[PDB]
């Protein structure tokens, strides 16, 4: 029951930095690398009294990578794991996919080869990357291609970050997003969307931090993934494995785009104000204001839902809450799915890290569902992608890097066909 | 044969269109199917066939073995066969004692199986001739016999209680070790040795 995580790009490796701090804190592993069997899914016991994570941080800019190398967890991470490139893709999918990718992918591949060989019961891979940048989108696509052709049958969970409908840090991100989401279609098994604006609003309204940084967003992502893998990590009343998602969340292999939610996202002062029960956290996990990606499920139809429960939860209350939500008419399920729910219960509630903002709560809910608002997200990105491509803006950068004009048009066509599938499946 | 052009790469279909716009114009028109669910099933089938084309990969290439103290000397040691165990098999308790077990149960247990019953009645005996000797040779047999309702004919084999020289039972017995009658604490008496 072992899972390895790979991180591509600045955002991916920062999310990994938060995730591994949370993982080391939850299992009582000191940052030096040794404790003062549940940890086997993340840390391999090397030699005697030593635990090393099953991860590789790979990036093109040496700045963040060697800053991590000289930071808090110097001895925790194996030196060879932290792969570092020499030149950035500079927000260029073509550059990081053809120019720089060809000499960095081999080292990552034959390192992950021995990482997988060290394991014995590998459940699958999970990738952390952002499609806005060049390194995450450019060589991440090549890495996914080579992993798919190398292993194939194994799961590859995708936690990607699309550009916000209005919030963005660059200009050329629509091109990278389209050229990455094409190869994200037929290489990853489960894709979980994560937009920064939604997390910003979640922190603003619920956690009430009026000046939040990327650290809080990474901490929330780490909490979500930890609550997601706690079923494999700890034994509970009703556990689900990593191969359950593809079994009960994707009706068709071409429709894997999951809406992320978490509850209760509360501060230390409000937690003393609201009561914390399963019914109200379950109700709060379905409101459009508590989603991790900007899309409204009201305009769409639910196809499937996954519910992860941690802490003081028994099957009676979760079953009652699921029944109540099923009878609710504010949200409507698709006709051909008469029961689109799947609940998992674990006994260990989420832990809190020092310096964090989340309150220590007895129970929590991690909601992952499939809807058709992802077709709205794709169209919203597509409109502004087509706005630029009409005047052939920034095209000369990509063409000189190795590609041509055909890739843009055919990726646009694939996005349109994918759109078509999203609207006409929900009928 | 994928209906959707999604499976193919970029420059692959670009070169196809440069060479043959003919196939290049089917792989778009292959989606003319009215039912989207049917086309999704065909896409699932073609993806499944492509996955079947690929080969499986084992995840146990590097065998990992736990070591007690991470030393070859320790790992390669096998413990020596040193035992102070009693040689007699009957001394060991392989079954519930016959005394507490019910009388009729002991009777039909004997009726199906005489041998291990005789061994349990005679814990010290080791050879078959000793165990199946007689109900009257051993003085300890009579309590078992009249507890389990087994009649004992008089004068069997002799009236005088004796006649088990090999087996050490009752008052007729002596340990083969040097301090006979036991309790050897020095070298002068033997210290329970030969």
């Amino acid at each position: 029951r072992e899972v390895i995580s790979i991180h591509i790009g600045q955002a991916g490796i920062q999310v990994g930095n938060a995730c591994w701090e949370l993982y080391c804190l939850e299992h009582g592993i000191q940052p030096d690398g040794q404790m003062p069997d549940a940890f086997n899914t993340f840390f391999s016991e090397t030699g005697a009294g030593k635990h090393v994570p099953r991860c590789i941080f790979l990036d093109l800019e040496p700045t963040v990578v060697d800053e991590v190398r000289t930071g808090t967890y110097r001895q925790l991470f194996h030196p060879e794991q932290l792969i570092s490139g020499k030149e950035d893709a500079a927000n260029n999918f073509a550059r990081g996919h053809y120019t720089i990718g060809k000499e960095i992918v081999d080292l990552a591949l034959d390192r992950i080869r021995k990482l997988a060989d060290n394991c014995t019961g590998l459940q699958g891979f999970l990738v952390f990357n952002a499609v806005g940048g060049g390194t995450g989108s450019g060589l991440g696509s090549l890495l996914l291609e080579r992993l798919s052709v190398d292993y194939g049958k194994k799961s590859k969970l995708g936690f990607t970050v699309y550009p916000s409908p209005q919030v963005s840090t660059a200009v050329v991100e629509p091109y990278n997003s389209v050229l990455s989401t094409h190869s994200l279609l037929e290489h990853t098994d489960v894709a979980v969307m994560l937009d920064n604006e939604a997390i910003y609003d979640i922190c603003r309204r619920s956690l009430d931090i009026e000046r939040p940084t990327y650290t809080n967003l990474n901490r929330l992502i780490a909490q979500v993934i930890s609550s997601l893998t706690a079923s494999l990590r700890f034994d509970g009343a009703l556990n689900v494995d990593i191969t359950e998602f593809q079994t009960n969340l994707v009706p068709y292999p071409r429709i894997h785009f999951m809406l992320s939610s978490y509850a209760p996202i509360i501060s230390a002062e409000k937690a003393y104000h609201e009561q914390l029960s399963v019914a109200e956290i379950t109700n709060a996990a379905f409101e459009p204001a508590s989603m991790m990606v900007k899309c409204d499920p009201r305009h769409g139809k639910y196809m499937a839902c996954c519910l992860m429960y941690r802490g003081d939860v028994v099957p009676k209350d979760v079953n009652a809450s699921v029944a109540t939500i099923k009878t609710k008419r504010t949200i409507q399920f698709v006709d051909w799915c008469p029961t689109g729910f799947k609940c998992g219960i674990n006994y260990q509630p989420p832990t809190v890290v020092p310096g964090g903002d989340l309150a220590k709560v007895q129970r929590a809910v991690c909601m992952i569902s499939n809807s058709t608002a992802i077709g709205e997200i794709f169209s919203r990105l597509d409109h502004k992608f087509d706005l630029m491509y009409a005047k052939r803006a920034f095209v000369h950068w990509y063409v000189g890097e190795g590609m041509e004009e055909g890739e843009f048009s055919e990726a646009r066509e694939d996005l349109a066909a994918l759109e078509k599938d999203f609207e006409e499946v929900g009928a | 044969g994928p209906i959707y052009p999604s499976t193919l790469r970029y420059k692959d279909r670009l070169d196809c269109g440069k060479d043959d716009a003919f196939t290049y114009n089917r792989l778009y028109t292959a989606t003319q199917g009215s039912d989207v669910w049917a086309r999704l099933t065909v896409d699932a089938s073609v993806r499944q066939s492509s996955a079947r084309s690929r080969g499986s990969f084992q995840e146990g290439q590097a065998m990992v073995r736990h070591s007690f103290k991470n030393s070859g000397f320790d790992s390669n040691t096998c413990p020596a066969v040193l035992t102070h165990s009693t040689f007699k098999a009957g001394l060991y308790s392989y079954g519930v004692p016959i005394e507490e077990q019910h009388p009729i149960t002991a009777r039909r247990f004997k009726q199906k199986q005489p041998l291990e019953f005789m061994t349990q009645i005679r814990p010290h005996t080791e050879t078959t001739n000793q165990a199946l000797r007689m109900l009257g040779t051993y003085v300890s047999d009579q309590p078992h016999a009249d507890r389990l309702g087994m009649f004992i004919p008089a004068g069997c084999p002799g009236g005088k209680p004796a006649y088990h020289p090999d087996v050490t039972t009752g008052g007729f017995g002596l340990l083969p070790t040097l301090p006979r009658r036991g309790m050897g604490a020095t070298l002068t008496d033997g210290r329970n040795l030969k």
């Binding site: 005697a48 030593k50 | 030393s71």
Partner: peptide
Amino acid sequence: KLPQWVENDRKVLRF
């Protein structure tokens, strides 16, 4: 803290 087999690798008791 370090593994036992490296803390005292050549330390030998002799009586």
